[PDB]
Write a protein that binds this DNA or RNA. Structure first.
Lengths: 590, 89, 618
RNA sequence: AGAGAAAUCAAG
RNA sequence: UUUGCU
């Protein structure tokens, strides 16, 4: 590790990219996820009271509590209603033009949203087939079920989809005609349970953690409301300087890094992450914040009901427990659902509903990212906190500019306390304040003085995508160029990545050594003229964006006869991608 | 979708990886190498594009220029630009 | 009193064109009408020689009649048009609506030119007009919307240009009952509590005076656990030829006898190797199952262990708890680091150079060439090539279910063409249904030296080829397909050390304002104490070796350790600059680091390296 | 046996 | 399933 700590030429911040092993295989999660899911579900209740009382905390509907119950030494799970109201009002009053842009989105963009965009999400657990299916098929099935049970043609607009859902929910019972004609029945309670059931799954390939953690997805019946709320959150977040949303992070971080006083004040840089970020928030606080925003916006009442419905359904959620907890009887091993045998999660046995567990507090990762970020950001608004703040969901960096060290420490503790106030706990061991400011880390970007190194979380897969030679070359060069101009690779590393990708791409298409393709080209005297044919590369660091065929033609490496043979549209081999069609644009069988 | 990415090397090395439409301009065998498969679109091997590049049916240069105009514009724009003395600082 | 993008004459005319105070909207109506007339003026400002168009609205009916008589058109009184192109003799009304696409035909008398609120226009209308006027209209409407949002008139403007909206959502009664089951508030929450932010008594922030120490675990030294070997990898040199010829040559001249037998890899398993080699010499990498294969690839071991466990079913069910066996930094990590940076007589990184067209291209290619020359002739490069070849050949045989033993030789070639047999990888009978399934492998490799404590589970045999002696280590492994694919392109490990080298060289060039691609200054590091630094080339080589080992030993422990060590690296950097590090209440980053120090020998090596550095800066 | 890590493969 | 990335 001392080898990664330079003391000359460069600094440890420069070598921060060495503290990465993404070139190795990412870990995977094995077998049952029930333990992780139950731990995530039980964490909120153990933190609600300073003295862990899970049973007493299992009856709380709205996770609201007085400031006397907020644990300032450990994680807290509740929220302060009055604090949430006042902070949301302050956020509205500060970023008023952002509120105006949100109102424009609501009064113009929101009505025209098309429900087809709902078919671009994770695999959905159909409430009829009882098995996960891709998003488009699940959307089609849900739409057909709605039309069959309502006897109407649901309009293309997304609000029509949401109103259709809210109407079917009024039906005392529903039926679905399968298609293979098999009938399926639903009681109002059964459909309500299906809609409020979140299906869990391991988060695979997640680097940077020792323990595997799960994620959850909602049903297709409530995904419309979730999309509406998330789009509104994105629209508001795009117009605030405190957000970490995928915005011009270079400009934002450079602007905050340049911030300095007249050299007499005290500057501090606090880099941190929130602990149990999802496992402490309460949807009631989120919906109250949204309601405050909308009411201050002068929005109609049906808009507020539409925005509140998804959080209401999330409050009465049902988390899928997976397969069960593992038990051993001597040398055997068996999975058993919670309830049959004693376990550390016995307190939650009363919440079991079939194979799903009911929980009102807490949240699951991967459902409300932008709303959680908004909830975190509203906390920062108050007179005490006069510093800058950037938040990307669970990561955050704050810049204090105070008159004295005492004011800086008071502001830091006030920031921590306010986050606790809205239900967000900064991981004390993961929070570090440097004074004077100048050194920090945030969103895998490491800032030192006036230099921000954007360390890539993952290396680009420097291999062909598998579509076809021309498309693969174009995509790979584009990926390398994007990773270069984002600061993740300088010119030398960009050229090296180009060479590595070139070698991998040539190998994948049998052009590097003695193969069937090269043997055929040698026997019949087919001089290699393209990169995938074995010809020397024509692209360079400066020409990573051009197309290979045009570049070769301009440089004289391709002749009019070869171009006419290659670019003949009558060849039987024919099928952002800007590769011109050619005989080398074939399609693989399987 | 990493599935095609991890299947390319195996896919390319299959006996008949390429799928192409039937066409008599592609011979059954050339110099002792089987090109197309008359299985019950048809299937061809990875050497078919190279054989075409060497012996395909040439098209009019007008079609080539029409196809390549968009990318040649960018190539010419790049090569026409003049880059000043590279600095260090 | 007026937007900065509104002129005076148009403003005064709009104020006097109608009685705006008797309508629902007293202000925004004037603004939108002025916007329409300003668009008309801007479009009519341009010319071909005559002006492109001409303003018609807001003028007396006399000119309307004159134009109708002359310019071959008729204009009624109800909805007077605004624009008319004489070059095309077509009448257009430039109306702006919020609906970018939905433009219902109000009338079929003439074509209608509907424009978006943000500047856009219809689907098949902007083509007729030129480009500059479209850009002007876009900019004007963008500025209009900017002013509207600045003055909080979004809803008023939407009402003005869209009439009135409607309640497009409603919630039933039973659905409300369902929704209000698990929350104390109604669908529209109205907590009857005055908004207020209370004051909470927190805890003070402690200073980090000294950097923490990482726990060093005790127990058996960690043995080698990578897929293949590292610095202890060798090869047999064979005459040039195909893989089949090289394997046949190896098989013909080979007397294999066990030196050291491990219980995990019984010596009988050697029969699975030779029988495979022979088959690969005859042109059939896939071979029929034999008796020894059962032990080699754990065939039916699932049922065997199921029965051996059910035999002890007399007991009570207990919550299955797991224990990961702690282990200490084995002594072979430093030896591996030393041997990985040893020199080689050949360059093992032969990547085709890119083309050079620009000075930047030349500089980049020079930097890459220098880096390859620096790290190309090291043992680590040869081991990387061996790993990549082995992983590729093994992963290419996992795309179809197979109940027969496959042969995947590890053979490279020197520039002269001589074959280099690093070893062999036999793939057992596999049925790949999930991409994360563990395929069974019997991996044989050529070793340089054998250590029982380092390779406890390997069986080492002697191998005599034309007099020359070699050690052949056999290991019964089970490896994931995903990890095999990841190692199939392990060549990416060369990027990070390349990043460090290029950054150092470019920093020196900037400081001197003149690139020197042959500079290797002294890098001061916290070394044992005998020396106080290293050259840039040696440091790059050491970084490459350590990064290769980290990639090979990348598991959740390594990921967590590296993720949680960045905080302490930043803290050390801050202390080195005489900055101050402050911590919240009950903070212990060292605990987060220590949670991930259990088994990984490379993690233990890095932790020991961290502990050796000074933990106080004065 | 083995791979591995908080629980799964070593077929069905 | 025929076997050649320094």
């Amino acid at each position: 590790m001392n080898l990664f700590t330079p003391r000359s030429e460069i600094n440890p911040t420069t070598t921060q990219e060495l503290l990465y092993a993404y070139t190795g295989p990412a870990p995977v999660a094995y077998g049952t996820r029930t333990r992780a899911v139950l731990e995530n579900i039980i964490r909120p209740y153990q933190y609600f009271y300073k003295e862990p009382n899970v049973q007493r905390a299992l009856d709380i509907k709205t996770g609201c509590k007085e400031p006397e119950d907020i644990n300032v030494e450990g994680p807290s799970s509740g929220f302060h209603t009055a604090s949430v109201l006042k902070l949301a009002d302050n956020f509205f009053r500060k970023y008023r033009p952002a509120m105006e842009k949100l109102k424009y989105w609501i009064l113009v963009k929101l009505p025209k949203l098309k429900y087809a965009e709902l078919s671009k999400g994770r695999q959905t657990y159909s409430f009829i087939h009882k098995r996960n299916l891709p998003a488009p098929i699940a959307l089609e099935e849900t739409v057909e079920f709605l039309e069959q049970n309502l006897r109407r043609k649901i309009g293309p607009t997304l609000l029509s989809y949401c109103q259709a859902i809210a109407d079917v929910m009024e039906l005392d019972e529903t039926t679905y005609e399968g298609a293979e004609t098999y009938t399926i029945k639903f009681s109002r309670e059964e459909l309500w349970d299906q809609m409020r059931t979140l299906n869990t799954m391991w988060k695979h390939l997640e680097r940077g953690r020792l323990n595997r953690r799960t994620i959850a997805t909602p049903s297709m019946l409530i995904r419309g409301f979730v999309k509406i709320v998330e789009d509104a959150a994105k629209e508001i977040l795009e117009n605030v300087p405190t957000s970490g949303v995928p915005v011009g992070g270079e400009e934002k971080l450079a602007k905050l890094a340049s911030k300095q006083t007249f050299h007499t004040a005290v500057t501090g840089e606090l880099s941190g992450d929130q602990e149990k970020f999802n496992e402490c928030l309460d949807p009631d606080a989120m919906r109250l914040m949204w309601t405050v925003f909308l009411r201050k916006l002068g929005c109609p009442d049906w808009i507020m009901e539409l925005f509140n419905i998804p959080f209401m359904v999330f409050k009465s959620k049902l988390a899928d427990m997976g397969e069960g907890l593992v038990y051993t009887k001597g040398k055997l091993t068996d999975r058993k659902p919670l309830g049959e045998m004693p376990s550390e999660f016995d307190d939650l046995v009363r919440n079991v509903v079939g194979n799903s567990i009911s929980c009102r507090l807490g949240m699951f990762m991967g459902m409300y990212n932008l709303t959680s970020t908004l909830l975190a950001l509203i906390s920062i608004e108050r007179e005490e906190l006069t510093g800058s703040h950037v938040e990307s969901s669970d990561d955050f960096i704050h810049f204090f500019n105070c008159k004295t060290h005492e004011e800086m420490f008071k502001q830091a503790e006030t920031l921590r306390l306010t986050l606790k106030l809205v239900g967000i706990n900064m991981s004390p061991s993961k929070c570090i304040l440097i004074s004077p400011a100048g050194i920090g880390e945030f969103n895998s970007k490491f800032h030192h003085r006036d230099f921000v190194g954007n360390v890539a979380t993952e290396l680009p897969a420097l291999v062909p995508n598998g579509t076809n030679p021309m498309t693969d070359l174009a995509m790979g060069l584009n990926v390398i160029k994007h990773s270069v101009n984002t600061g993740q690779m300088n010119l030398c590393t960009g050229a090296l990545a180009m060479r590595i990708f070139n070698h991998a791409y040539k190998y994948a298409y049998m052009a590097l050594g003695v193969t069937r393709r090269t043997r055929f080209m040698e026997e019949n005297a087919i001089t290699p003229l393209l990169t995938n044919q074995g010809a020397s590369p024509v692209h360079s660091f400066s020409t990573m964006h051009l197309d290979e065929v045009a570049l070769r033609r301009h440089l004289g490496l391709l002749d009019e006869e070869t171009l006419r043979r290659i670019l003949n549209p009558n060849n039987p081999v024919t099928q952002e991608d800007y590769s011109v069609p050619s005989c080398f644009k074939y399609t693989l069988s399987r | 979708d990493h599935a095609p990415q991890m299947r390319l090397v195996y896919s390319v090395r299959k006996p008949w990886p390429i799928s192409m439409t039937p066409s008599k301009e592609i011979p059954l065998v050339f110099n002792g190498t089987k090109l197309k498969d008359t299985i019950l679109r048809t299937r061809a091997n990875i050497v078919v594009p190279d054989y075409w590049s060497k012996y395909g049916s040439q098209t009019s240069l007008e079609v080539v220029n029409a196809i390549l105009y968009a990318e040649d514009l960018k190539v010419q724009r790049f090569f026409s630009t003049e880059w000043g003395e590279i600095r260090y600082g | 009193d007026r937007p900065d993008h509104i002129d005076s004459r148009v403003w005064e005319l709009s104020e006097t064109q109608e009685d705006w105070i008797t309508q629902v909207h007293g202000h925004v109506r004037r603004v939108v009408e002025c916007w329409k007339y300003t668009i008309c003026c801007l479009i009519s400002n341009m010319h071909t020689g005559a002006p492109q168009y001409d303003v018609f609205k807001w003028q007396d009916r006399s000119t309307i009649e004159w134009i109708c008589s002359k310019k071959k058109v008729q204009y009624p009184e109800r909805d007077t048009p605004d624009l008319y192109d004489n070059e095309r003799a077509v009448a257009y009304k430039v109306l702006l609506v919020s609906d970018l696409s939905d433009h219902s035909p109000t009338s079929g008398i003439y074509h209608d030119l509907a424009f978006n609120l943000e500047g856009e226009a219809e689907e098949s209308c902007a083509l007729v007009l030129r480009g500059s006027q479209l850009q002007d209209i876009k900019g004007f409407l963008c500025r209009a919307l900017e002013w509207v949002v600045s003055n909080n008139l979004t809803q008023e403007v939407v009402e003005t240009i869209s009439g009135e909206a409607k309640l497009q959502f409603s919630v039933g009664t039973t659905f409300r009952t369902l929704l209000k089951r698990d929350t104390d508030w109604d669908v529209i929450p109205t907590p009857r509590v005055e908004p207020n932010v209370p004051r909470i008594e927190g805890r003070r922030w402690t200073q980090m005076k000294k950097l923490p120490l990482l726990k060093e675990k005790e127990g058996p030294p960690s043995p080698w656990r990578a897929l293949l070997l590292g610095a202890d990898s060798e090869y047999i040199v064979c005459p040039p030829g195909t893989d089949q010829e090289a394997i046949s040559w190896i098989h013909s001249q080979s007397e294999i006898e066990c030196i050291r037998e491990s219980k995990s890899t019984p010596a009988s398993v050697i029969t699975c190797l030779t029988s495979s080699l022979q088959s690969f010499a005859e042109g059939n990498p896939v071979r029929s199952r034999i008796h020894e294969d059962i032990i080699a690839f754990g065939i039916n071991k699932k049922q065997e262990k199921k029965q051996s466990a059910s035999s002890s079913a007399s007991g009570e069910w207990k919550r299955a708890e797991y224990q990961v066996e702690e282990m200490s930094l084995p002594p072979w990590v430093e030896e591996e680091m030393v041997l990985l940076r040893s020199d080689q007589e050949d360059n093992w990184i032969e990547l085709e150079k890119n083309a050079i067209y620009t000075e930047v291209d030349g500089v980049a290619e020079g930097l890459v060439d220098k880096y390859i020359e620096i790290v190309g002739r090291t043992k680590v490069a040869s081991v990387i090539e061996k790993w990549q070849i082995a992983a590729t050949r093994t992963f290419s045989q996992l795309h179809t279910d197979r109940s027969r033993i496959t042969a995947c030789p590890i053979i490279t070639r020197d520039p002269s063409g001589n074959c280099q047999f690093w070893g062999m990888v036999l793939l057992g009978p596999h049925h790949v249904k999930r991409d994360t399934d563990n395929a069974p492998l019997l991996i044989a490799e050529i070793m340089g030296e054998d250590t029982e404590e380092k390779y406890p589970k390997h069986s080492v045999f002697s191998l005599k080829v034309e007099g020359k002696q070699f050690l052949l280590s056999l290991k019964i492994t089970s490896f994931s397909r995903n990890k095999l694919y990841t190692f199939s392109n392990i060549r990416r490990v060369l990027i990070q050390p390349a990043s460090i080298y290029s950054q150092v060289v470019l920093s020196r060039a900037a400081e001197n304002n003149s690139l020197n691609l042959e500079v290797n200054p002294e890098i001061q590091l916290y070394l044992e104490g005998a020396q106080r630094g290293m050259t840039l080339y040696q440091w790059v080589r050491m970084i490459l070796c350590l990064e290769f080992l980290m990639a090979i030993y990348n598991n959740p422990q390594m990921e967590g350790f590296l993720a949680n060590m960045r905080r302490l690296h930043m803290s050390r950097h801050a202390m080195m600059e005489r900055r101050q590090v402050f911590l919240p209440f009950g903070s212990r980053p060292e605990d987060k680091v220590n949670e991930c120090i259990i088994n990984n020998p490379i993690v233990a090596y890095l932790a020991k390296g961290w502990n050796s550095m000074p933990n106080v800066y004065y």
